[PDB]
Amino acid sequence: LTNHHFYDESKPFTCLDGSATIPFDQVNDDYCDCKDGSDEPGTAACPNGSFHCTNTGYKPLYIPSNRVNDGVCDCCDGTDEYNSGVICENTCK
Amino acid sequence: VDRSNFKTCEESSFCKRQRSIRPGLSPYRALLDSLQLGPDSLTVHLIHEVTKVLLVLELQGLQKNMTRFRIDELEPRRPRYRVPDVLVADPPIARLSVSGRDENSVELTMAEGPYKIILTARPFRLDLLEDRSLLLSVNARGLLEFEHQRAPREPGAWEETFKTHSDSKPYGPMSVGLDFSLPGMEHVYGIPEHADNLRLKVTEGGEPYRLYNLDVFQYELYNPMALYGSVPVLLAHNPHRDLGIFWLNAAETWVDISSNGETPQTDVRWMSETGIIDVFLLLGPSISDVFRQYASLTGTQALPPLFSLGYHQSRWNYRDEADVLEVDQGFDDHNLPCDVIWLDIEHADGKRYFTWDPSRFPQPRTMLERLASKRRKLVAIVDPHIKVDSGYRVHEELRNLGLYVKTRDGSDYEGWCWPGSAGYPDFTNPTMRAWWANMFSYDNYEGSAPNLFVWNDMNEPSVFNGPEVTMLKDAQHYGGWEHRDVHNIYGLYVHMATADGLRQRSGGMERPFVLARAFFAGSQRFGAVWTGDNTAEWDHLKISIPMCLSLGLVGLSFCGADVGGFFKNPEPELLVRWYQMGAYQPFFRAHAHLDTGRREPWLLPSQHNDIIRDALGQRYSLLPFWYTLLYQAHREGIPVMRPLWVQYPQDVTTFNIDDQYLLGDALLVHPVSDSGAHGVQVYLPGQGEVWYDIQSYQKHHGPQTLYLPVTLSSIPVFQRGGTIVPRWMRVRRSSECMKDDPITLFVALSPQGTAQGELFLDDGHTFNYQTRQEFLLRRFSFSGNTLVSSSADPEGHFETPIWIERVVIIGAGKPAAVVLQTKGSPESRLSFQHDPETSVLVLRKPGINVASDWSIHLR
Ligand SMILES: *[C@@H]1O[C@H](CO)[C@@H](O[C@@H]2O[C@H](CO)[C@@H](O[C@@H]3O[C@H](CO)[C@@H](O)[C@H](O[C@H]4O[C@H](CO)[C@@H](O)[C@H](O)[C@@H]4O)[C@@H]3O)[C@H](O)[C@H]2NC(C)=O)[C@H](O)[C@H]1NC(C)=O
Ligand SMILES: [Ca+2]
Numbered sequence: 001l002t003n004h005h006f007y008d009e010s011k012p013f014t015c016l017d018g019s020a021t022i023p024f025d026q027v028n029d030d031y032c033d034c035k036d037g038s039d040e041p042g043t044a045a046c047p048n049g050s051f052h053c054t055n056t057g058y059k060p061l062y063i064p065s066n067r068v069n070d071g072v073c074d075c076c077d078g079t080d081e082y083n084s085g086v087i088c089e090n091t092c093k
Numbered sequence: 094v095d096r097s098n099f100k101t102c103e104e105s106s107f108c109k110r111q112r113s114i115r116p117g118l119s120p121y122r123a124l125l126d127s128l129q130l131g132p133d134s135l136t137v138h139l140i141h142e143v144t145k146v147l148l149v150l151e152l153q154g155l156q157k158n159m160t161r162f163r164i165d166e167l168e169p170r171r172p173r174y175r176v177p178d179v180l181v182a183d184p185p186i187a188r189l190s191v192s193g194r195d196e197n198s199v200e201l202t203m204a205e206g207p208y209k210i211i212l213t214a215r216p217f218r219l220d221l222l223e224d225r226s227l228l229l230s231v232n233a234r235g236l237l238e239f240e241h242q243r244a245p246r247e248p249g250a251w252e253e254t255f256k257t258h259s260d261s262k263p264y265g266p267m268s269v270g271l272d273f274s275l276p277g278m279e280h281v282y283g284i285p286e287h288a289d290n291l292r293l294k295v296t297e298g299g300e301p302y303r304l305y306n307l308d309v310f311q312y313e314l315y316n317p318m319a320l321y322g323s324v325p326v327l328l329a330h331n332p333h334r335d336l337g338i339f340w341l342n343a344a345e346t347w348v349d350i351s352s353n354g355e356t357p358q359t360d361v362r363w364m365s366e367t368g369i370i371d372v373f374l375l376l377g378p379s380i381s382d383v384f385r386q387y388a389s390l391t392g393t394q395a396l397p398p399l400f401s402l403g404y405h406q407s408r409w410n411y412r413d414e415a416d417v418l419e420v421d422q423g424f425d426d427h428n429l430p431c432d433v434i435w436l437d438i439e440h441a442d443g444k445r446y447f448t449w450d451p452s453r454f455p456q457p458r459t460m461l462e463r464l465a466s467k468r469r470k471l472v473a474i475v476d477p478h479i480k481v482d483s484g485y486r487v488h489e490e491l492r493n494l495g496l497y498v499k500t501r502d503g504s505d506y507e508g509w510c511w512p513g514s515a516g517y518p519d520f521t522n523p524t525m526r527a528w529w530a531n532m533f534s535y536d537n538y539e540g541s542a543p544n545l546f547v548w549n550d551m552n553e554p555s556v557f558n559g560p561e562v563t564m565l566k567d568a569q570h571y572g573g574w575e576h577r578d579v580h581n582i583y584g585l586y587v588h589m590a591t592a593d594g595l596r597q598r599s600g601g602m603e604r605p606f607v608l609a610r611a612f613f614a615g616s617q618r619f620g621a622v623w624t625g626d627n628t629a630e631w632d633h634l635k636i637s638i639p640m641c642l643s644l645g646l647v648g649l650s651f652c653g654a655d656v657g658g659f660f661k662n663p664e665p666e667l668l669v670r671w672y673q674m675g676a677y678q679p680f681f682r683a684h685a686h687l688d689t690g691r692r693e694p695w696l697l698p699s700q701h702n703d704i705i706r707d708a709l710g711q712r713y714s715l716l717p718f719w720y721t722l723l724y725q726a727h728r729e730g731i732p733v734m735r736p737l738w739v740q741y742p743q744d745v746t747t748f749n750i751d752d753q754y755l756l757g758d759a760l761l762v763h764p765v766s767d768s769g770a771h772g773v774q775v776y777l778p779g780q781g782e783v784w785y786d787i788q789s790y791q792k793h794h795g796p797q798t799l800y801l802p803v804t805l806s807s808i809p810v811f812q813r814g815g816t817i818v819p820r821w822m823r824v825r826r827s828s829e830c831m832k833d834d835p836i837t838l839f840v841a842l843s844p845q846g847t848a849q850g851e852l853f854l855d856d857g858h859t860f861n862y863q864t865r866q867e868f869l870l871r872r873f874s875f876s877g878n879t880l881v882s883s884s885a886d887p888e889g890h891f892e893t894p895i896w897i898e899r900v901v902i903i904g905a906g907k908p909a910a911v912v913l914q915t916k917g918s919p920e921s922r923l924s925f926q927h928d929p930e931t932s933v934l935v936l937r938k939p940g941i942n943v944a945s946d947w948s949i950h951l952r
């Protein structure tokens with residue numbers, strides 16, 4: 001969802017822009033704490049953001065944050081509807 | 094425009110013969126000996142002093158402060174036309190009793206109440222009294238005209254001749270007319286579908302206002318000439334009173350407005366070609382009261398499905414089915430919200446409806462499934478005129494049954510459309526309506542999907558070669574009635590038939606959406622309308638507001654107009670300004686022309702693209718507010734887009750304002766209507782009232798005229814102090830993913846620190862909210878420093894995954910502890926943020942379901 005190893009184990013998830021700081025518990029709580037939207041990488045809460053879909057095919061790319069849990073598959077792997085309920089199968093070839 | 098193809102009052106024979114009567118003493122008088130009072134109604138016989146013709150006046154008092162009177166001949170050669178299917182049901186009757194009696198006048202009490210009616214014998218005159226206060230007068234100036242049924246055999250009293258069309262009159266002249274005088278009132282609105290201002294001007298130095306359904310090609314502005322629609326409702330407003338006039342007649346109508354029981358400060362005059370006199374008087378005493386009275390008379394606005402509230406994309410030259418895919422991929426590639434894609438007449442197989450040309454669109458059902466995979470809808474055009482073909486089985490099936498409009502000699506009216514010819518079915522026949530409704534089945538309509546809908550055009554009807562651009566008046570319809578009797582009900586019948594078919598195709602479960610051009614009183618129960626085909630000019634952008642305001646004043650709440658104009662493809666600045674204008678209207682759809690180009694949000698310049706996307710996001714975020722407003726309009730009849738004087742009936746300055754409007758009672762919208770204007774002046778009314786702009790949250794006290802500078806990205810919208818507005822702050826592709834998205838509440842505090850708001854929630858595409866009572870009506874109230882939620886209607890049960898995700902309070906100090914209280918749970922603490930400069934407070938993640946009531950306390 002982040003595609004980078006920014007750990008939430010020891011330090012709290014401070015920021016990426018540098019303006020606001022939050023604890024690591026507030027990450028992925030379906031609320032956009034930071035104006036950059038970095039606190040909700042795998043969630044559609046942030047109006048501005050991205051979602052790095054993971055697949056073994058040939059299309060590693062970001063999608064707009066509003067494409068998560070919208071009932072329509074937007075990536076190769078069916079990861080955007082992980083909580084929506086619309087089951088999808090990968091076409092990574 | 095071409096004024097040659099349309100009649101004036103001189104060319105129209107009955108208008109000329111009726112306006113020749115100067116005001117003065119009336120020859121009609123009432124015989125008080127032949128007066129019969131019954132519990133149901135009151136009946137009296139009137140006589141003409143000169144020609145000695147007997148008429149019958151029937152008077153009824155209807156509950157909720159209404160009355161209705163009818164005038165008709167006593168011995169007619171044939172019965173006259175009485176308009177059916179406009180009134181939803183028989184109105185309740187209030188008993189009338191004779192209060193006082195005199196030799197010349199007799200007065201009757203309206204009901205167990207204060208209203209009363211005085212009828213005078215010589216001359217005949219009706220007066221309405223609220224206790225001892227005069228409301229209005231009937232036949233005060235002696236302008237009553239009733240051309241009786243002549244012998245079955247002077248120019249204009251018989252067969253006339255148009256520029257090249259001969260209009261016979263087998264039954265002779267049967268003109269009717271009346272005048273009303275309203276003392277103390279100087280402001281009258283109504284008679285919609287005229288390209289004029291919100292306030293009707295006097296018509297003494299010009300032509301009267303014309304109510305007649307016509308297809309006016311390239312119409313201009315500020316004219317009293319007729320247009321596509323016609324609703325004969327007039328509303329007279331006073332700082333202390335408000336009255337309404339309903340003229341139930343389906344013929345061609347001319348209405349005169351004058352200013353001056355010898356001093357009535359506003360006079361209205363109605364003149365109709367045929368029929369009886371059937372007049373409804375609405376006695377107020379409030380604007381909401383006359384709104385509710387008219388809603389009880391002719392029904393309320395039908396609740397639309399949620400997807401119809403979004404952005405609609407239309408274009409004439411959608412050539413291939415791959416073009417629809419290109420448009421959808423452009424919408425989903427440039428991150429532009431869209432709900433419905435529209436198809437023009439090109440989709441039909443050579444104007445043959447209910448079918449798809451195999452070369453045009455190979456597989457329509459599969460394309461509809463592909464579009465529904467992205468959760469979008471398609472809409473096709475269906476005209477009430479069909480091709481005359483021996484293979485197109487619609488014509489043969491309609492011919493064998495016999496459901497056509499008959500011409501002068503009994504043959505079939507076959508006015509030819511541009512491909513081949515065309516036939517016109519008789520929509521007045523109920524059997525024809527049943528057949529039309531049954532033809533919308535999935536088995537009948539080939540390539541039919543639940544995500545496909547129908548919009549009606551040219552339902553006036555519009556004849557290419559005929560008198561004006563409409564049908565001949567001597568055509569014989571069902572029931573032995575001429576076309577001049579049923580001209581204004583054709584569009585209503587077409588709209589009702591299409592709505593019935595679309596709702597019946599799903600077994601009576603899904604909510605239909607039918608959009609029609611021509612209409613009448615009572616069409617709001619069958620769908621929506623638009624303001625025809627307007628060119629792309631700044632003047633049309635200015636006039637877009639009063640037309641929708643007039644339409645909403647008579648129950649047609651879901652008004653709108655084409656985005657970007659129809660003719661004369663707009664400049665980018667005008668395009669952006671119209672997009673901002675239409676982002677705050679009930680209906681929002683972009684249309685083009687064959688001679689124009691491809692104007693789409695992604696094809697616009699890069700700087701304008703962000704502005705268009707922001708406007709679309711603002712439109713899509715206010716979806717719960719629009720849905721609640723439409724539910725309130727459906728349940729009560731109060732319009733969604735209402736003028737300023739409705740909420741403030743005592744401010745005279747608001748009496749002539751059409752530059753700005755109100756979306757319910759919380760949002761004031763004054764869009765930019767000038768090319769490169771450096772700023773706009775917005776009038777803020779209210780005695781000790783505050784308004785907060787959406788962008789900067791600046792507080793402005795009323796009443797005043799604030800001059801605020803604007804830019805290309807400025808949409809001037811104010812929230813009224815003391816209101817609560819729900820929003821969806823996450824943009825989604827369409828309006829179906831947002832159905833289960835969290836709600837953010839915006840609270841604008843009053844100077845006393847109070848606010849109130851409502852929210853309506855449902856699945857959005859079924860009738861379950863009426864049968865099984867499956868809906869959610871929530872009421873939020875901010876009192877003191879406590880914000881609570883409750884159920885406005887207790888009998889509304891609905892399970893929704895929506896949870897409230899953020900609270901915004903405008904105009905409050907910082908708290909020391911914000912808590913949340915629920916049912917049978919310990920209170921928790923919520924983190925908050927405060928901005929001292931703009932005095933805004935944000936409460937983060939209440940995390941509570943909407944259906945469950947709670948309470949938030951601020952310390
Ligand atoms: C049918 O007709 C009857 C008779 O007209 C009508 O009842 C009337 O309703 C009006 C409006 O509700 C009443 O007028 C009110 O009277 C009270 C008492 O004097 C006044 O205080 C009110 O003024 C308040 O409102 C102002 C404007 O909103 C505010 O600035 C301020 O708060 C004022 O206090 C208002 O004038 C009238 O008294 C009754 N009359 C009777 C006999 O009941 C009824 O509503 C109509 N019904 C329908 C369905 O049309
Ligand atoms: Ca968060």
Ligand SMILES: [Ca+2]
Nearest residue numbers: 067072074080
């Ligand atoms: Ca998705």
